[PDB]
């Protein structure tokens, strides 16, 4: 009938996936759990019949998946995006992980009581990671060349998130600033960001010291 | 000539990969950085010509990879282990991530000043995660059935590590205890664990409050 994507009504681990979906113009319904609906989730966690109960979850009627990275890869795999040979598939997983180093580096410290200080540490390292992507892009339109791949959306999500921790972390990385704008210009993405379905905030769980609240 | 696998002379993010290598009986040399050799690494970090300088790194002469998960997947991809169709490839990435929830859950708290207290929290949740694997195994010899897949080694590494945090976390999970023993009985793995190449300790960086030291 139509695949279902379940997660908290926040950006978190699933935002890049939503972006990929719209880009592919894939049909999908959403199970959005509000901050006061942990009971509704705890009442459904073991009912869906998922192998490893967790959020997010993607039910395809053909499958019952639960790891965010397995879900994003599965979707792209359906559209033959992921590789073509070991070497290319590896290149794409390398991009994946390097963005995760940034995205996860934020999730780690966010939520913590010492966030305000840990922030200093993470931000002092951010430039070295950003640089790797800035160079990559110096001779490629997208992360993997002329064509889009799911890591492009992962990187976009990461960029969106760090700009909130520090509005200036991109000054010094013009290629990254263009890339952020180029992704937003994709007809499908432009349409999505201006739509009712776009979850602009929060970045993390509503409880996080960073990216939380409303 | 022969692929090179570079990393700190510890288990860390690369142990499951070493296990996979031996299992496949793949030829490979190692660049092992000792705790007093950060200079040697900082002097090589930008020389290898890797796209995203980091540890671990896998140089195939055919490729220059750096994300631990991209490296383990690449190796198995060379041996046609990873899938056969989207659905199977997804199932295998789901297993990946679920083990990482355990392995990374340890790395997160290890290294911290509050480790001793965070330990209580992580251990109180460990059972729920362990249970998912115990059930999976109730009707399958390995994680993906009758045949081995790289997540099997990831899970073995995870098991090895938690048994140090709490020697009793496996009491109550007999299938998991057998699985741990079954992996150790693979001719290739048995041979490796008894060899000079096996890095038994440390689990994390020598600095970690947990898994560190000598
Ligand atoms: N490694 C998993 C982690 C998932 C996860 O931690 N999800 C959180 C939200 S970001 C959820 O609250 N877990 C629900 C649960 O464990 O019941 C993934 O990549 O999906
Ligand atoms: N997400 C990366 C992280 C790698 C990483 O953090 N490696 C640590 C050791 S566990 C190393 O010290 N990094 C070396 C560096 O950043 O120069 C991966 O999966 O490989």
From Swiss-Prot, chains A, B:
Presence of keyword DNA repair: no
Anything else known: There are at least two isoenzymes of GST in S.japonicum.
Natural source organism: Schistosoma japonicum
Protein name: Glutathione S-transferase class-mu 26 kDa isozyme
Reaction catalysis annotation: RX + glutathione = an S-substituted glutathione + a halide anion + H(+)
E.C. number(s) listed in UniProt: 2.5.1.18
GO molecular function terms attached to this record: glutathione transferase activity
GST N-terminal domain ranges (all copies): 2-83
Subunit and interaction comment: Homodimer.
Record-listed substrate binding positions: 111
Gene3D superfamilies xref list: 1.20.1050.130
């Amino acid at each position: 009938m139509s695949p279902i994507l379940g997660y908290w009504k926040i950006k978190g681990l699933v935002q890049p996936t939503r972006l990929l979906l719209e880009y592919l113009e894939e049909k999908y319904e959403e199970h959005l759990y509000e901050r006061d609906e942990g009971d509704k989730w705890r009442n459904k966690k073991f009912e869906l019949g998922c192998e490893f109960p967790n959020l997010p979850y993607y039910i395809d009627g053909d499958v019952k998946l639960t790891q965010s990275m397995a879900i994003i890869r599965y979707i792209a795999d359906k559209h033959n995006m992921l590789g073509g040979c070991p070497k290319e598939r590896a290149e794409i997983s390398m991009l994946e992980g390097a963005v995760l180093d940034i995205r996860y580096g934020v999730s780690r410290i966010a939520y913590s009581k010492d966030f305000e200080t840990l922030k200093v540490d993470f931000l002092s390292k951010l430039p070295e990671m950003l640089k790797m992507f800035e160079d990559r892009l110096c001779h490629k339109t997208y992360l993997n060349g002329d064509h889009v791949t799911h890591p492009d959306f992962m990187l976009y999500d990461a960029l969106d998130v760090v700009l909130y921790m520090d509005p200036m972390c991109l000054d010094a990385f013009p290629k990254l600033v263009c890339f952020k704008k180029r992704i937003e210009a994709i007809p499908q993405i432009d349409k999505y960001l201006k739509s009712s379905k776009y979850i602009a905030w929060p970045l993390q769980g509503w409880q996080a010291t960073f990216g939380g609240g409303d």
